[PDB]
Every structure is written in structure tokens, then in C-alpha cells.
């Protein structure tokens, strides 16, 4: 997913401070970040479901 692409970039330019060149065996951890993007989108559907409920719960409590 887009998140895996993000975890390749984040693994690179990291250790660039250490001037370590290019990438190494732990660097290819974009499968783990790919999981983060999937969860972040999934959290938003649940968050949006809850966000609609937060407005409706406020109205039910308001009465």
C-alpha cells in the first residue's frame, strides 16, 4: 500500500545522519509500515463511525 512506500523512505534518509550509505537488511521493513497504513485507514472508518456517534451521543445526552 502507500504506507509500505512510506516505510521505505522513512528507513532511508534514516542513518543518513550516520551517513550510513543506501539501505541494509533491517531497512526493508516496508511490510510492517504497509500494515500501519491499513490500520490507520481502518481506525478512521471506526473513528468516523464513532465521530458520527459522538455528535448523536451528544444530542441524545443533550435531551
Ligand X SMILES: CCCCCCCCCCCCCCCCCC(=O)OC[C@H](COP(=O)([O-])OCC(O)COP(=O)([O-])OC[C@@H](COC(=O)CCCCCCCCCCCCCCCCC)OC(=O)CCCCCCCCCCCCCCCCC)OC(=O)CCCCCCCCCCCCCCCCC
Q: Which residues bind ligand X (CB under 6 A)?
A: 25-26, 28-29, 31-32
Half-sphere exposure (Cβ direction) of 56: Cα atoms closer than 13 Å = 6
What are the cell numbers at 38?
491499513
What are the cell numbers at 19?
551517513
With CB under 5 to 8 Å by kind, the binding choice for 48 among other proteins, ligand X, ligand T7X, none is: other proteins
Q: How far is CA 60 from the centre of its chain?
A: 33
11-40 positions binding ligand T7X, by CB under 6 A: 11, 26, 29, 33, 36
Query: Between 32 and 49, whose beta carbon lies closer to ligand T7X?
Result: 32
What are the cell numbers at 57?
451521543
Q: Is 60 in the site for other proteins (CB under 8 A)?
A: yes
Amino acid at each position: 500500500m502507500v504506507g509500505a512506500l512510506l516505510g521505505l523512505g522513512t528507513q532511508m534518509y534514516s542513518n543518513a545522519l550516520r551517513k550510513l550509505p543506501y539501505m541494509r537488511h533491517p531497512w526493508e521493513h516496508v511490510v510492517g509500515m504497509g500494515l500501519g497504513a491499513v490500520f490507520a485507514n481502518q481506525l478512521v472508518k471506526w473513528d468516523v463511525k464513532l465521530k458520527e456517534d459522538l455528535d448523536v451521543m451528544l444530542a441524545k445526552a443533550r435531551a
